[PDB]
Paper text:
CRISPR-RNA (clustered, regularly, interspaced, short palindromic repeats-RNA) along with Cas proteins assemble into RNA-guided adaptive immune complexes in prokaryotes. These CRISPR–Cas systems defend bacteria and archaea against the invasion of foreign genetic elements. The type I-C subtype is one of the most prevalent systems found in bacteria.
To understand the molecular basis for small-subunit incorporation, we determined a 3.1 Å resolution cryo-EM reconstruction of the type I-C Cascade complex, suitable for de novo model building (except for the flexible N terminus of Cas8c). The overall architecture of the complex resembles a caterpillar. Seven Cas7 subunits form a right-handed helical filament around the crRNA and Cas5c sits at the base of the complex. Cas5c residues “pinch” the phosphate groups within the crRNA backbone on either side of the U5 nucleobase, inducing a sharp (33°) kink. The belly of the complex contains the large subunit, Cas8c, and two copies of the SSU, which nucleate and are derived from the C-terminal domain of Cas8c (residues 489–612). Remarkably, the electrostatic surface potential of the type I-C Cascade reveals a contiguous channel of positively charged residues that runs along the length of this minor filament from the large subunit.
Residue numbers in the entry:
A (entry chain I): 78 to 124, 160 to 175, 240 to 253, 259 to 286, 329 to 519, 522 to 561, 564 to 612
B (entry chain B), E (entry chain C): 1 to 166, 171 to 290
C (entry chain A): 8 to 227
D (entry chain K): 1 to 31, 34 to 73, 76 to 124
């Protein structure tokens, strides 16, 4: 048929078309395999499927006809498009629902987080809501995901089951609802050009829209990105040198919630007493003692990967170096300080032995506890006039 | 080529060491991962490519075993070679009308192509020849435990294109799996073999190819892959004697009791096979 | 005949749509054509045929993305050629040129179905009682785990585990009509080798397909 | 979870003994005026450092006998009760053993706290 | 040209002493470790680079022994040199159309480049010369027992730029492995060799480069690295006589009975090598 275009892809050309030989089934000519009003002996499109719903849209704008209809529908209509690493469309106007469906792109909000369905009227109804995310190869568009639900209970999953998970203390001044683009970008090497395509973009987009579990490679991705990064504030302009940022931590928290177990959502629960959480807090206070004793520019050899997965065989030397750092501290009139070693005794108290290994979910708890005990010690909180 | 009179199952255990057994072309080149369980995947066509490669090498083009490899050529050249060998009409593009000529082209393609004879090959062309299914249908191999891949940043001294910032040197990245033990499930239906002449000698070649599948595929990405245990389930009837899923769960691959932590060698894995139905002979000497 | 309900389930499945064939996007559920093809991989003889009356969906519908390097167009010859000898090496480039397609399958996960099916009798029948003998041979094969070939769930990359369900159709995941499935393929016709598509009655618990051999379409 | 006096694992014992030795030394003089620290060579050399640690600890405890301030002979009794389970000082320790050493140190240090381990 | 007709498997034992055998670009410059077990890793490209350096040194860049140098060479310019050396045009952004032309450019890139002929290369860039796998492979070297990387903080009396804070001084850093005995596995496949003409003299050059690999690669960051044992398995045929894992398990590396502390010398280790199968000959004379 005619060509779909204008998606963020390679050639912006048509989909559902055959140009090769190995897509030949029950031999048909070139586009009779997918016959939608082209050969009028049978039409797939109305004579839970996407191009029939498209055709349902292309006759909502008018107060081979099927091909014409749905390909002028994919040729949108203005604002119903977005991109995570591949295009994502949506459409419903049967009651003028005030389209606000977004992947996301102090205390900046327009709705609740999760307390009830939003108080703006004409937003809670039964009219269906469609969301089609289609990805490019070179000129053929894989339907990476497709969703039909009701905005009556689509908002009830996109935030009212999803941003209730990534809610976590804001480390700095930024947005409360972390946008899916920023969330995915903290899992890539450096930027949103190398977002893992299938098992993060499509995977957890489908999770956000669907309420199903996250991919079982979301947490290993954030883990292996925590290891593969290092503090470097001399290369970035936005102020953040942390390796466990607000987004990596929020995302590990959401994974641990919707896959494993309920965990601390707040700045710090010092009554937690779960060995991974406690070891993360201990690592955090060690690095605090280090960075306070010597300004550290601002460089330190990275043991977070080592201590997260093999706590004993690293925490021995980590605690010895922390003793040295508290010594260098107490040598100066910076000790009445001395409550760093006190915190270390307190945390070691609840720990019978340093565990040999830690599972990936235990590592995620380690990262969450580190993030918590890290924001606990900083001095920036609630700065907005 | 007397076809096989028994049908088979097989469970192949192969492990990887500091390598990438299979990359996902959508996840960069990271090892494939089942997003619903976490265990690493290795698609069936991956191991089929490795089987074809082993048969290509170990046979040196010895006829009755030509293996449609990758080379600088096209299928349709040989579709048409068979065509002129049988003197047909070049127009038809589906299954031909007369049965003897289509059967002749299919039987020539199956009598001298081990991969067509074993896995099948689809010969629908402007000059058509038909289809084949072939006995051996393999499936996605999945690790026994969730694998976690490690991004290994590497460096290169030289630069490909002209330099303007020399830094200019680029940083590469090797995705490796520290360890994984992958289990593949296989099925060899005897009647499809009877339709494509898949013989007994072909079956022993298939077993050797499953055993030495990686001894010939070494490279910078794979590291040390190796076939650890190959377990064969042979049914006495040419149809089944016991369900497929019933036999595949006779293979319990657990962690050896002496170990703890993430596995890093096949010594950290104990494999046991239970007793089989009265009409199934389980062969583990491979 | 009496009908028989077979249970078929697996980890992966891909019942490809007709439109989205190059970058595969499976139907939510097993269609009648795939179901009958599963049946004919357990028992089938050119004297009989299989018809499907219902398909019960016993598990959530969950999709997944798996891209594979795949052979592209086996492109028509621009210049005729012939082999130098009868039996010698000939090839197919599967790694150079545009002969590597990388098709992305949007295939299902953890699927579980129960198929209701029966036995008509066509030409080359031989008798009028073939229904009983063949129905009982299939029942024996389903019980004993026997099969002409390992059934798949769509593509042969996904093998189907099959048992004979003689008890009650187990608890499904869908008790109220929260799914309509759109408009699916009924069964590829072979009298004319065309595509009849059926879905005009909603899916409530079990997709209720009409017989492909009596009403090819709502058009007729 | 807290200090376990029945743990009787040698690195744990050494960590506790080191904690109580440095407790005796710090009860001698506040901190002279600075906590003398050679934990490094102690986990490096357990015995070759612990013997002189024990000499200096004997000095500190024998000096603390004149003053009625006590928390002092209890330190000596604890030294006996710890050394009682130990035999043949270890030439070298391992990574997990040094982690256990630090764990036992901080445990015995929490036990001898100014609050006597009633607050967390 | 000629090529080897024996399958070769080798195990090389090298150790470090207060040095950094291989740095991690993502961990600062800390030695590469497996973060879940603590064993130290040495990338295969590292040892390949050391072999390339030894060959560029002992041959001073003679003919047929160029090396794809580390002196900021441009790889596209080398490809273009290949194209002009075969009298073809390099302007195709892909391989030449005539398969003989691509064969010539790749046989040229292999014929006069030891490291391409041996370790293969990817020359599919703005000026495409193709792909080579190359017979010799190596996998990451993994120590025998976990290494403990210690950070040796150092200083320097001088400032590079204009600094106005220097009694005070600038601090530096070093990472040394007090000791690590590393084990590396290798594979020399005769099919790929006969594809690249990797000869016998190339093999003996490679063995010597493996022995004397570290005698000339000294720096302020390596300490004393040394190749202790080199075990080589010559299978009697062009394909294999025994699996690779059967051989790499004949090399048992344990700790000697007397020593108890952390390993600090090669005499703290015992290394035994079993008797190979009837199809393989083991030579430990390197």
């Amino acid at each position: 048929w005619e060509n779909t275009s204008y998606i963020l892809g390679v050639d912006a050309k048509g989909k559902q078309e055959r140009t090769d030989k190995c897509h030949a089934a029950f031999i048909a000519h070139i586009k009779a395999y997918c016959d939608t009003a082209d050969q009028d002996l049978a039409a797939v499109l109305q004579f839970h499927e996407r191009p029939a719903a498209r055709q349902a849209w292309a006759n909502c704008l008018n107060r081979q006809e099927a091909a014409f209809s749905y390909v002028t529908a994919l040729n949108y209509l203005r604002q119903k498009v977005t991109i995570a690493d591949a295009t994502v469309v949506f459409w419903a106007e049967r009651s003028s629902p005030a389209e606000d469906i977004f992947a996301g792109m102090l205390l900046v909000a327009i709705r609740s987080g999760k307390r009830a369905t939003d108080i703006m009227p004409d937003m809670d109804e039964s009219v269906r809501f469609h969301v089609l995310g289609l990805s490019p190869n070179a000129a053929r568009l894989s339907v990476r995901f497709w969703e039909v639900d009701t905005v009556g209970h689509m908002l009830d999953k996109v935030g009212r089951h999803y941003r209730e998970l990534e809610i976590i203390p804001q480390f700095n001044n930024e947005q409360e609802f972390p946008s899916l683009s920023t969330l995915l970008r903290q899992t890539a090497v450096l930027n949103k050009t190398e977002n893992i395509s299938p098992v993060l973009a499509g995977g957890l987009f489908r999770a956000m829209l669907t309420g199903g579990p996250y991919p079982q490679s979301l947490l290993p991705a954030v883990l292996g990105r925590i290891r593969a990064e290092h503090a470097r504030p001399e290369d970035k302009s936005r102020y953040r040198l942390e390796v466990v940022t607000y987004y990596r931590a929020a995302l590990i928290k959401a994974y641990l919630i919707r896959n494993r177990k309920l965990e601390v959502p707040v700045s710090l629960d010092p009554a937690r007493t779960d060995r991974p959480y406690l070891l993360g807090r201990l690592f955090a206070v060690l690095e605090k003692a280090q960075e306070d004793a010597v300004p550290g520019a601002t460089i330190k050899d990275r043991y977070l990967a080592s201590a997260s997965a093999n706590p004993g065989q690293v925490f021995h030397m980590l605690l010895k170096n922390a003793s040295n750092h508290t010594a260098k501290l107490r040598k100066d009139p910076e000790r009445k300080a001395i409550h760093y070693e006190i915190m270390m005794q307190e945390i070691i108290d609840n720990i019978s032995d340093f565990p040999v290994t830690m599972s990936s979910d235990e590592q995620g708890l380690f990262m969450i506890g580190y993030y918590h005990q890290r924001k606990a010690l900083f001095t920036k909180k609630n700065k907005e006039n | 080529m007397t076809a096989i009179a028994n049908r088979y199952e097989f469970v192949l255990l192969f492990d990887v060491e500091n390598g990438n057994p299979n990359g996902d072309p959508d996840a960069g080149n990271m090892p494939r991962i089942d997003p619903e369980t976490g265990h690493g995947l290795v698609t069936d066509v991956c191991l089929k490519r490795k089987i074809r490669n082993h048969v290509a090498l170990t046979k040196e083009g010895a006829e009755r075993f030509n293996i449609y490899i990758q080379e600088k050529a096209i299928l349709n050249e040989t579709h048409e070679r068979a065509y002129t060998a049988c003197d047909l009409k070049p127009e038809p593009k589906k299954l031909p009308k007369k049965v003897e000529d289509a059967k002749r082209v299919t039987d020539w393609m199956c009598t001298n192509f081990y991969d067509i004879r074993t896995f099948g090959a689809v010969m629908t062309t402007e000059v058509n020849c038909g289809q084949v299914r072939g006995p051996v249908q393999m499936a996605f191999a999945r690790s026994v435990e969730p694998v976690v891949p490690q991004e290994v940043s590497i460096t290169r001294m030289a630069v490909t294109t002209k330099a303007e910032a020399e830094d200019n040197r680029t940083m590469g990245r090797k995705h490796i799996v520290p360890y994984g033990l992958y289990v593949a499930h296989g099925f060899i239906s005897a009647p499809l073999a009877e339709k494509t002449g898949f013989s007994d000698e072909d079956l022993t070649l298939f077993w050797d190819a499953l055993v030495n599948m990686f001894e010939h595929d070494r490279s910078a990405a794979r590291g040390l892959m190796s076939s650890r245990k190959l377990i064969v389930f042979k049914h006495q009837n040419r149809l089944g004697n016991a369900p497929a899923h019933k036999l595949f769960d006779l293979v319990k691959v657990s962690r050896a009791e002496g170990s703890s932590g993430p596995a890093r060698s096949f010594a950290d894995y104990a494999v046991t096979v239970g007793q089989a139905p009265e009409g199934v002979e389980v062969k583990e000497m491979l | 005949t009496y009908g028989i309900r077979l249970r078929v389930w697996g980890d992966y499945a891909c019942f490809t749509r007709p439109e989205m064939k190059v970058e595969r996007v499976s139907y939510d559920v097993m269609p009648p054509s795939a179901a009958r093809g599963i049946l004919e991989a357990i028992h089938w003889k050119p004297a009989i045929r299989w018809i499907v009356d219902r398909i019960h969906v016993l598990r959530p519908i969950v999709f997944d993305n798996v891209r594979r390097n795949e052979v592209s167009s086996k492109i028509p010859k621009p210049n005729p050629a012939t082999a130098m000898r009868d039996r010698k090496p000939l090839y197919f480039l599967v790694d150079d040129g545009s002969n590597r397609q990388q098709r992305a399958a949007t295939l299902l996960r953890n699927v579980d179905y129960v198929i209701e099916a029966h036995f008509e009798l066509t030409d080359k029948a031989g008798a009028e009682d073939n229904a009983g003998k063949h129905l009982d041979i299939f029942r024996r094969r389903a019980r004993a785990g026997q099969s002409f070939q390992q059934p798949c769930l769509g593509c042969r990359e996904f093998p189907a585990s099959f048992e004979l369900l003689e008890g009650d159709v187990p608890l499904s995941c869908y008790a109220g009509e929260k799914r309509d499935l759109g408009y699916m393929l009924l069964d590829i016709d072979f009298e004319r080798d065309m595509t009849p598509l059926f879905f005009k009655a909603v899916m409530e618990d079990g997709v209720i397909t009409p017989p492909s051999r009596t009403s090819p379409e709502v058009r007729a | 979870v807290s200090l376990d006096p029945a743990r009787t694992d040698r690195p744990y014992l050494l960590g506790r003994l080191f904690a109580v030795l440095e407790k005796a030394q710090e009860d001698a003089v506040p901190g002279a005026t600075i906590k003398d620290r050679y934990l490094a060579s102690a986990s490096a050399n357990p015995g070759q450092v612990f013997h002189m640690l024990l000499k200096n600890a004997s000095n500190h405890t024998a000096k603390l006998r004149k003053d009625p301030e006590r928390k002092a002979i209890h330190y000596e009794i604890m030294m006996q009760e710890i050394i009682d389970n130990i035999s043949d000082f270890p030439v070298t320790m391992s990574s997990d053993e040094q982690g256990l050493f630090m764990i036992g140190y901080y445990h015995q240090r929490k036990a001898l706290f100014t609050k006597k381990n009633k607050e967390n």
